[PDB]
Design an enzyme around this catalytic site. Structure first.
Site, short mmCIF file in Angstrom:
data_model
loop_
_atom_site.label_atom_id
_atom_site.label_comp_id
_atom_site.label_asym_id
_atom_site.label_seq_id
_atom_site.Cartn_x
_atom_site.Cartn_y
_atom_site.Cartn_z
N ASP A 22 80.26 70.22 76.57
CA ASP A 22 81.14 69.09 76.28
C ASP A 22 82.56 69.59 76.04
O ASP A 22 82.78 70.52 75.26
CB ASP A 22 80.63 68.32 75.07
CG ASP A 22 81.36 67.01 74.86
OD1 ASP A 22 81.09 66.05 75.61
OD2 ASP A 22 82.20 66.94 73.94
N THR A 57 86.60 64.01 78.35
CA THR A 57 87.42 65.03 77.69
C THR A 57 87.70 66.21 78.61
O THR A 57 88.84 66.67 78.71
CB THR A 57 86.73 65.49 76.40
OG1 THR A 57 85.71 66.43 76.72
CG2 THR A 57 86.13 64.30 75.68
N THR A 58 86.66 66.72 79.28
CA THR A 58 86.87 67.80 80.25
C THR A 58 87.82 67.38 81.35
O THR A 58 88.79 68.09 81.66
CB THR A 58 85.53 68.24 80.84
OG1 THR A 58 84.65 68.64 79.79
CG2 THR A 58 85.73 69.41 81.78
N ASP A 98 77.26 60.82 74.15
CA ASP A 98 77.90 60.55 75.44
C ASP A 98 77.17 59.45 76.20
O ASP A 98 77.81 58.54 76.74
CB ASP A 98 77.97 61.83 76.27
CG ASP A 98 78.93 62.86 75.70
OD1 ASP A 98 78.95 63.05 74.47
OD2 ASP A 98 79.69 63.47 76.48
N1 LIG Z 1 75.07 64.05 90.24
C1 LIG Z 1 76.41 64.16 90.39
N2 LIG Z 1 76.96 64.46 91.58
C2 LIG Z 1 78.29 64.58 91.74
N3 LIG Z 1 79.17 64.41 90.75
C3 LIG Z 1 78.76 64.10 89.50
C4 LIG Z 1 77.32 63.95 89.25
N4 LIG Z 1 77.19 63.64 87.95
C5 LIG Z 1 78.43 63.59 87.41
N5 LIG Z 1 79.37 63.86 88.34
C6 LIG Z 1 80.83 63.89 88.11
O1 LIG Z 1 81.23 65.07 87.40
C7 LIG Z 1 82.39 64.75 86.63
C8 LIG Z 1 82.46 65.51 85.31
O2 LIG Z 1 81.35 65.31 84.44
P1 LIG Z 1 81.59 65.66 82.89
O3 LIG Z 1 82.23 67.01 82.77
O4 LIG Z 1 80.37 65.34 82.08
O5 LIG Z 1 82.65 64.50 82.58
P2 LIG Z 1 83.93 64.63 81.64
O6 LIG Z 1 84.99 65.24 82.51
O7 LIG Z 1 84.11 63.18 81.34
O8 LIG Z 1 83.50 65.49 80.49
C9 LIG Z 1 82.43 63.24 86.46
O9 LIG Z 1 83.61 62.73 87.09
C10 LIG Z 1 81.22 62.74 87.21
O10 LIG Z 1 81.57 61.60 88.00
MG LIG Z 2 80.65 63.26 80.84
#
Ligand SMILES: Nc1ncnc2c1ncn2[C@@H]1O[C@H](COP(=O)(O)OP(=O)(O)O)[C@@H](O)[C@H]1O
Ligand SMILES: [Mg+2]
Ligand SMILES: Nc1ncnc2c1ncn2[C@@H]1O[C@H](COP(=O)(O)OP(=O)(O)O)[C@@H](O)[C@H]1O
Ligand SMILES: Nc1ncnc2c1ncn2[C@@H]1O[C@H](COP(=O)(O)OP(=O)(O)O)[C@@H](O)[C@H]1O
Ligand SMILES: [Mg+2]
Ligand SMILES: [Mg+2]
Lengths: 529, 523, 525
Positions: C58, C91-92, C392
């Site tokens: 996270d 956040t990432t 989340d």
């Molecule tokens: N199965 C998947 N295939 C492709 N992309 C995905 C999948 N699951 C999540 N993502 C994308 O990966 C990105 C980053 O996820 P994450 O790091 O948890 O989000 P955040 O940046 O909000 O912390 C998101 O934009 C999401 O749309």
């Molecule tokens: Mg996420």
């Protein structure tokens, strides 16, 4: 050009004493090396030929044991991956009570083989996939490796034969005596319902004589003396009070307000007459023994002596509760005489001297009850603590058998059969998962290897013999520790058996710990406070 | 050792002291010289508390920096003075004071006496005041469009300039609601009754001024309503608990029933307080002190929602907003003290916190500006900018006279002073004309911070201001060209610019009078 | 310099130096957090100064736990903290887009372009991107299947896939249970209890409540079948008088009478409870469980046990509401006039001991508007990781309900918004077209990093995806298993419209303000 500067970004913004590791080399391999070192620290204690260790903790307390979880607790493990493996071992201790050293050995083996696979060119993801699929196959297989079942846990010979294996790895020299004692205690406190509580097995360690002088006691023992003049009672009518043996006072500040010489002259006589009435009501209910969780007043003690009541003071509340469970009584928060139901009974309550120590014994004569005590004799406190750990192993094995009565062959037989079957599964599985499946299989070989190395024989010949016999078809064959040369024999016919649940949970937890250590890729330690 | 003064007493004197003071002051000026105008850049200040302040505000910057030179101390103090008095011009004042001291350095090096320079400066200040008041223009404060332009001309130089319309309307609404008159005394108290609550997250475009107030509070008991559409509100300064007496009220019990009777008496006391409250039939009860659980029980039985421990300031704002009167003895509670006027009490979850809204009020003499944005720092800067906007709105509503910006006022005043100086025949004509040309620093700095040619533009502007009806001509801080302020729209409050000039001239006078520094001596 | 002539121990970064400092720190954070992005991201281990272990993917947790002392890093940590407090996700991506905006702007500022012009282009691009986002958002009837896809898209990034398949159903059912139609979702009504005994896939949803404490009297039952639940906030222990009182007696008999009398006040409340119990349970068929937010002394515990009541004490102020929403009674601060309508019902109540801790389960409620997620796992760090993941996921489903719209994921919206911004660029006046281009190339960091983490060539993957989106116009993203373009709306990869909007807004704002910083200064000494 005589200094390499920190690179722009995280390397410069990192705090002073903080550390950052990233990648297979700095993080994955260093974690695997730490877990390997841990498994090596505890490998030589595995099995009946396992040797004891003399750990001195930061408080200069001494532990002499070959119990993996105890050694880990008393060690100052500081590497985080090793801490994670220790957390897995402690979770095994919590769930099952035995198998912590299996967890350590197996996790270390999985991690070493994972490092080898990463070097040959597999990715942590593929290694984890194969390890998980192979753990699933092992769990699918183990039920088929179950050989025997308990078939009766109310007996004392069968239960002894069942607990002997768990209490053999610890305390190899004298295991028939200990299995007899622990079986007697477990079946004494085993109720008609299938629920068994391990806290109802009490252990009293008294210095003096030796492990063969230990005994079981259907009742309770307290390293206490009696408060009054009575020391023995043969038909106990115990009355238990969580309140002191004194006159009740107000929770709000109480003041004796005297205004006349008559009130002043009569107050103290009235107090003692009140105490005499209270204790005489208690004695007239038939109570010959009173057990108070609080303090005793001199006047109340006087009158208890007058009315021939044995007074006992148990400082602890857990001790008071367990005594209530023992005798069938109810702890009264008031000094009111107990009703016929609130009273407890014991075929005898007496003060004795076991060795130098004075003890108060609430002893039932019947071969049953809610609580049983094992009085451990021994020439050393460290020896008695190790025997208490062995007792804990036997009792936790009894509980595991109350939960699941299934048993697998020991001495590495189940591990070898698992290795063989999972290797046969990996030989059919195509794709890069087969490498990890086969390494997960080969990791099981670490168990008979550790047993053989500690027996004092060549593990490669032992393992070859086991593989040959399990290929010919004998799944209950494992290594014989009573042989100076590499040997093997029928673990079932020998009576060396493990718990299906023990193996299940040990495999699951070791695999989970290894997989988490592998899932780590970057480490950001903070400055050690 | 036979000393007369204690060691550590160091005494400097003379032109070294004078030049040192002038250099310290002009250094304070160079610190924030670039933070003036619409094209300024932000500065990230690091507090001793690990905090951060990202701002363009001269007073914020100078208040966050620390100095040891007493002249610099005096300059920081005059920035604070400008901020407390008018709430704008905090960097115009610093720059003008620095330039005045700079031009006085000349005359001091040329054997002129500081008192001569000071008398000339005071003459020039009076004439500056005259010229500003002559060139000022009036305002119809009932013209919301004129007022919004006044507020835009003040916040364009700040970060919120991107949300100019939003921030202008917020500030105007807040000030117009805080405008209050009682017993013939008009009062715009935008410090006690216009509240800014910064809730990180959301987007700035959803920030708003509420027709009511908002506090970070929840109901005392979850059985209480969280939504009421015509709440009758009661405010209290007293605890609805059973507290002890002021005297040594010690009791003495000898009878059995007396302990229970005393505890039941406590319960009956709480019941009687709660009945004194219920008799007014409120919907909401808001306290600055505690509310016992038994009191909560009785209020809930009466279908009343209670909020336990509110701040005195928040309670005063709730009073002004919902029309209530804080009480301290529910026995002394009256219908006139009950709060009717709130149109809705809501208690909603913003993120993972519970916020109490008392909005939809009619004639609320208090408000809460709910700021939403990316972070506490962004919202701190938005709050400071909104303080600027509201203080400018207030200064206008008090004195409706306006003067032109873009340096137009500085150039008009400089020209008028130069024109008046030709009748001056003594030796003060030189410092007098010097402060006149020292007012030119505002357009100079504007041009510099826009990135244009100061020499050429200031020459063209000084020439434009020699014509007759050109006292409104200034410069854009956004393009680097001369324009008519009547066409651009940058009009400052006469009160603001008067306070600026006065503070600058007096700071110069003070530092000129100063000589012979002494130090070390311990109180 | 100027500040250093007045405060000699002052630290200052000038116009070139302050921009370099800020952009360098932003790119450093971006370099650390690049690996968190997506389900193929890597878990970092974080060790406190005490030795405590955190396993996290996270962005916010990683930020707050890294050992950093940088001002720009503090700014970005705070913007990310706001993102987390309001949306639960992003956040990432927030940190990555901030870093990429700063980098793409430095690309033009190093060649002498002014940051003011870059920020003007940022404003134009923010406007057009918000428009395109509202345009591409999918307004959908929030069915269990859609909510499952959303919660999966979040939990699969935060934890392993099988554990994600468990937590998905857990989170979706919990929210679909505590949610009332057209009534903002109070996530407080989903308790989150951690148990440290079993596997991580044992994490379940109890359609009721789990209190982290149990009865303190041993004779009290450990299992109750048809239970009347009394939710109270009334002290059942000895209460001293507010005014100082004290007892005065002249004889031990009077002392005894006063000892019996001093408890009458609480004995009366115990009797009120006991009489209600007898009136509602004329026999031992049903059960009666008292749950007190306050204490219960041993005398009261004995009195209630004797009558067959299971009394738990010192419950939680939130459990008062959670119990009245699960069971269905009324939480009381007084027993003045208590009636059977004040009671709730639970079709089962029992106790669970785990080592030294006890738990109390209250299940088989009728239609509980409050539930609990029981986080089971073998390690404290496993439990913490699952807690973060379920936070989340709960936020994700809640946001999908609030915003009846849902946005495609896998970098699809970023690809499409970049193309739209580049087609919009000519309508922008001056060299703010370069700020627009920088905004677009910054938006493209999400698909780029997704490819980088799945193990693909960023440029090749991005060219394939952009080509597919230009030829077809369909919203396509990264397939993390093949590196090919895929329709996120068709494969069920969803993002939160609120999260994307908050990203655009807050990232643009903080990047603009950082680019416009021209002096970093520590002079408080
Ligand atoms: N199965 C998947 N295939 C492709 N992309 C995905 C999948 N699951 C999540 N993502 C994308 O990966 C990105 C980053 O996820 P994450 O790091 O948890 O989000 P955040 O940046 O909000 O912390 C998101 O934009 C999401 O749309
Ligand atoms: Mg996420
Ligand atoms: N008599 C025996 N012969 C061979 N193996 C034995 C014998 N007794 C115990 N073992 C083996 O010792 C192992 C457990 O030893 P121990 O050190 O207690 O490890 P753990 O902590 O994993 O229980 C098991 O593989 C068990 O089968
Ligand atoms: N669009 C503009 N063009 C030129 N000058 C402007 C413009 N907007 C404001 N100004 C001038 O900038 C000055 C205010 O700048 P600011 O940074 O707010 O400093 P302060 O308020 O501390 O004096 C005033 O002289 C004002 O007239
Ligand atoms: Mg063992
Ligand atoms: Mg201003």
């Amino acid at each position: 050009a005589l200094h390499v500067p920190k690179a722009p970004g995280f390397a410069q913004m990192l705090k002073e004493g903080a550390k950052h590791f990233s990648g297979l080399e700095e993080a994955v391999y260093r974690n695997i090396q730490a877990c390997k070192e841990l498994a090596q620290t505890t490998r030589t204690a595995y099995g009946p030929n396992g040797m004891n260790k003399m750990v001195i903790n930061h408080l200069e307390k001494l532990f002499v044991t070959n119990d993996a979880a105890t050694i880990l607790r008393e060690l100052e493990v500081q590497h985080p991956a090793a801490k994670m493996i220790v957390m897995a071992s402690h979770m095994q201790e919590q769930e099952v009570g035995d198998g912590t050293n299996f967890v350590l050995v197996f996790a270390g083996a999985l991690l070493e083989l994972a490092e080898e696979l990463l070097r040959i060119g597999l990715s942590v993801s593929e290694v984890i996939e194969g390890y998980e699929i192979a753990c699933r196959k092992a769990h699918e297989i183990l039920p088929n490796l179950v050989c025997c079942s308990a078939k009766n846990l109310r007996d004392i010979d069968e239960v002894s034969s069942l607990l002997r294996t768990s209490i053999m790895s610890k305390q190899y020299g004298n295991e028939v005596f200990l299995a007899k004692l622990i079986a007697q205690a477990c079946v004494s406190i085993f109720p008609d319902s299938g629920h068994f509580n391990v806290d109802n097995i009490r252990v009293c360690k008294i210095l003096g004589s030796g492990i063969s002088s230990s005994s079981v006691l259907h009742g309770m023992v307290f390293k206490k003396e009696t408060e009054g003049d009575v020391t023995s009672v043969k038909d106990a009518k115990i009355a238990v009070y969580s309140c002191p043996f004194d006159g009740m006072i107000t929770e709000t500040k109480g003041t004796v307000l005297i205004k006349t010489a008559e009130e002043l002259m009569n107050f103290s006589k009235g107090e003692e007459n009140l105490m005499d009435a209270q204790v005489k009501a208690i004695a007239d209910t038939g109570a010959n023994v009173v057990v108070t969780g609080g303090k005793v007043a001199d006047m109340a003690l006087h009158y208890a002596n007058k009315y021939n009541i044995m007074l006992v003071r148990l400082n602890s509340k857990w001790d008071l509760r367990r005594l209530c469970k023992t005798v069938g009584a109810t702890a009264l928060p008031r000094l009111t005489p107990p009703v016929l139901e609130e009273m407890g009974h014991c075929d005898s309550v007496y003060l004795s001297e076991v060795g130098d120590t004075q003890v108060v014994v609430f002893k039932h004569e019947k071969e049953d009850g809610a609580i049983s005590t094992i009085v451990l004799r021994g020439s050393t406190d460290n020896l008695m603590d190790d025997i208490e750990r062995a007792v804990d192993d036997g009792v936790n094995t009894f509980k595991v058998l109350t939960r699941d009565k299934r048993l697998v062959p020991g001495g590495g037989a189940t591990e070898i059969e698992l290795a063989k079957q999972i290797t046969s599964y990996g030989e059919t599985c195509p794709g890069l998962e087969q490498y990890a499946i086969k390494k997960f299989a080969e990791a099981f070989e670490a168990i008979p290897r550790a047993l053989a190395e500690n027996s004092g024989v060549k593990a490669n010949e032992v393992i070859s013999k086991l593989y040959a016999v399990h290929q010919e078809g004998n799944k209950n064959v494992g290594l014989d520790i009573e042989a100076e040369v590499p040997a093997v024999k029928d673990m079932l016919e020998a009576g060396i058996l493990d718990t299906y649940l023990g193996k299940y949970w040990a495999i699951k937890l070791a695999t989970n710990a290894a997989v988490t250590v592998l899932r780590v890729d970057q480490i950001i330690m903070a400055k050690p406070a | 050792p036979v000393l007369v003064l204690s060691q550590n007493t160091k005494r400097e004197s003379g032109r070294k002291v004078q030049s040192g003071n002038i250099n310290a002051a002009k250094t304070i000026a160079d610190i924030i010289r670039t933070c003036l105008g619409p094209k300024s850049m932000m500065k990230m200040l690091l507090d001793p508390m690990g905090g951060i302040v990202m701002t363009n505000d001269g007073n914020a910057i100078l208040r966050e920096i620390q100095v040891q030179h007493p002249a610099a101390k005096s300059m920081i103090e005059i920035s604070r003075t400008q901020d407390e008095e008018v709430g704008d011009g905090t960097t115009s004042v610093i720059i003008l004071a620095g330039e005045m001291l700079s031009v006085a350095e000349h005359f001091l090096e040329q054997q002129m006496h500081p008192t001569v320079v000071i008398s000339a400066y005071r003459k020039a200040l009076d004439d500056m005041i005259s010229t500003l008041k002559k060139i000022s223009i009036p305002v119809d404060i009932s013209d919301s469009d004129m007022m919004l332009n006044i507020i835009n001309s003040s916040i364009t130089t700040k970060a919120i300039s991107r949300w100019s319309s939003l921030a202008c309307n917020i500030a105007l609404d807040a000030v117009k609601m805080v405008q209050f008159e009682e017993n013939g005394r008009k009062e715009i108290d935008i410090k006690k009754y216009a509240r800014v609550e910064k809730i990180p997250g959301g987007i700035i475009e959803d920030s708003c001024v509420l027709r009511g107030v908002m506090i970070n509070k929840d109901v005392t008991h979850p059985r209480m309503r969280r939504y009421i559409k015509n709440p009758r509100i009661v405010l209290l300064d007293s605890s609805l608990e059973y507290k002890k007496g002021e005297s040594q009220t010690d009791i003495e019990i000898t009878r059995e029933e007396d302990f229970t009777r005393i505890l039941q008496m406590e319960e009956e006391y709480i019941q009687q307080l709660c009945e004194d409250i219920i008799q007014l039939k409120p919907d909401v009860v808001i306290t600055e002190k505690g509310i016992s659980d038994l009191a909560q029980h009785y209020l809930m039985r009466a279908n009343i929602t209670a909020i336990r421990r509110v701040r005195k300031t928040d309670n005063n704002r709730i009073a002004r907003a919902c029309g209530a009167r804080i009480v301290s003895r529910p026995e002394e509670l009256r219908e006139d003290d009950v709060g009717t006027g709130a149109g809705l009490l809501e208690i909603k979850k913003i993120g993972d916190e519970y916020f109490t809204f008392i909005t939809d009020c009619k004639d609320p003499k208090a408000c809460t500006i709910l700021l939403r944005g990316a972070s506490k720092e962004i919202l701190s800067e938005v709050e400071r900018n909104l303080q600027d906007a509201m203080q400018v709105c207030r200064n206008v509503l008090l004195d409706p006279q306006l003067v032109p910006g873009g340096g137009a006022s500085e150039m008009a005043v400089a020209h008028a002073l130069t024109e008046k100086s030709k009748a001056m025949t003594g030796v003060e004509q030189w410092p007098y004309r010097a402060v006149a040309q020292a007012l030119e620093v505002i357009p100079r700095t504007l041009i510099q911070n826009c990135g244009a040619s100061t020499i050429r533009l200031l020459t063209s502007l000084r020439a434009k201001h020699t014509q007759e009806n050109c006292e409104t001509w200034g410069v854009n801080g956004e393009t680097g060209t001369l324009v008519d302020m009547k066409e651009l729209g940058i009009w400052e409050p006469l009160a603001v610019k008067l306070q600026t000039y006065k503070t600058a001239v007096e700071t110069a006078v003070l530092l000129l009078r100063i000589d012979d520094i002494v130090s070390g001596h311990k109180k | 310099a100027a500040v250093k002539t007045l405060n000699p121990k002052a630290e200052v970064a000038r116009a070139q130096a302050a921009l370099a400092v800020n952009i360098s720190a932003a790119r450093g954070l971006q370099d650390v957090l690049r690996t968190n992005l997506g389900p193929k991201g890597t878990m970092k281990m974080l060790v406190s100064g005490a030795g405590d272990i955190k396993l996290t993917k996270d962005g916010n947790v990683l930020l707050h736990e890294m050992q950093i002392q940088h001002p720009t890093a503090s700014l970005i940590a705070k913007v990310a903290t706001a993102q987390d407090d309001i949306t639960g996700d992003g956040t990432t991506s927030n940190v990555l887009i901030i870093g990429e905006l700063l980098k793409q702007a430095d690309l033009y500022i190093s060649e002498g372009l002014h940051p003011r012009i870059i920020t003007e282009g940022f404003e134009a691009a923010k406007e057009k991107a918000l428009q395109f986002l509202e345009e591409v958002k999918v307004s959908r009837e929030m069915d269990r299947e859609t909510l499952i896809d959303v919660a999966r898209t979040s939990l699969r990034t935060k934890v392993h896939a099988e554990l994600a398949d468990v937590l998905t159903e857990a989170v979706v059912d919990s929210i679909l249970a505590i949610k009332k139609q057209d009534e903002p979702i109070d996530l407080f009504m989903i308790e989150i209890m951690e148990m440290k005994h079993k596997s991580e896939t044992d994490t379940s949803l109890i359609r009721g409540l789990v209190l982290d404490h149990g009865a303190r009297h041993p004779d009290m039952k450990k299992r109750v079948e048809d239970a009347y639940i009394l939710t109270c906030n009334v002290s059942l222990e000895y209460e001293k008088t507010e005014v100082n009182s004290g007892f005065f007696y002249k004889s031990a008999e009077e002392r005894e009478k006063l000892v019996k009398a001093e408890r009458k006040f609480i004995e009366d409340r115990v009797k009120k409870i006991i009489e209600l119990k007898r009136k509602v349970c004329g026999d031992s068929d049903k059960g009666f469980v008292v749950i007190n937010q306050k204490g219960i002394d041993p005398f009261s515990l004995d009195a209630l046990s004797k009558e067959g009541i299971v009394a738990l004490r010192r419950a939680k102020r939130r459990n008062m509401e959670r119990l009245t929403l699960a069971c269905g009674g009324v939480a009381l601060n007084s027993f003045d006039d208590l009636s059977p309508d004040c009671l709730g019902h639970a079709g089962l109540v029992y106790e669970y001991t785990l080592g030294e801790e006890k738990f109390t389960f209250i299940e088989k409620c009728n239609n509980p508007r409050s539930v609990t997620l029981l986080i089971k796992g073998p390690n404290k760090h496993t439990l913490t990781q699952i807690k973060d993941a379920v936070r989340d996921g709960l936020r994700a489903v809640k946001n999908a309900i609030d915003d009846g719209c849902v946005v495609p994921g896998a970098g699809a919206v970023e690809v499409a918004m970049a193309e739209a911004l580049i087609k919009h660029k000519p309508s922008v006046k001056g060299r703010a077209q370069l700020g627009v281009q920088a905004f677009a190339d910054a938006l493209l960091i999400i698909p780029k990093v997704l490819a980088q983490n799945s193990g693909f060539d960023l440029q090749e993957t991005l060219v394939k995806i952009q080509a597919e989106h230009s030829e077809s116009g369909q919203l396509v993203g990264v397939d993390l298993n093949t590196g090919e373009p895929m329709v996120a709306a068709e494969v069920g990869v969803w993002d939160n419209y609120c999260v994307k909007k908050q990203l655009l807004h807050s990232c643009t704002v903080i990047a603009t303000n950082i680019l416009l910083v021209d002096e970093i200064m520590r002079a408080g000494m």
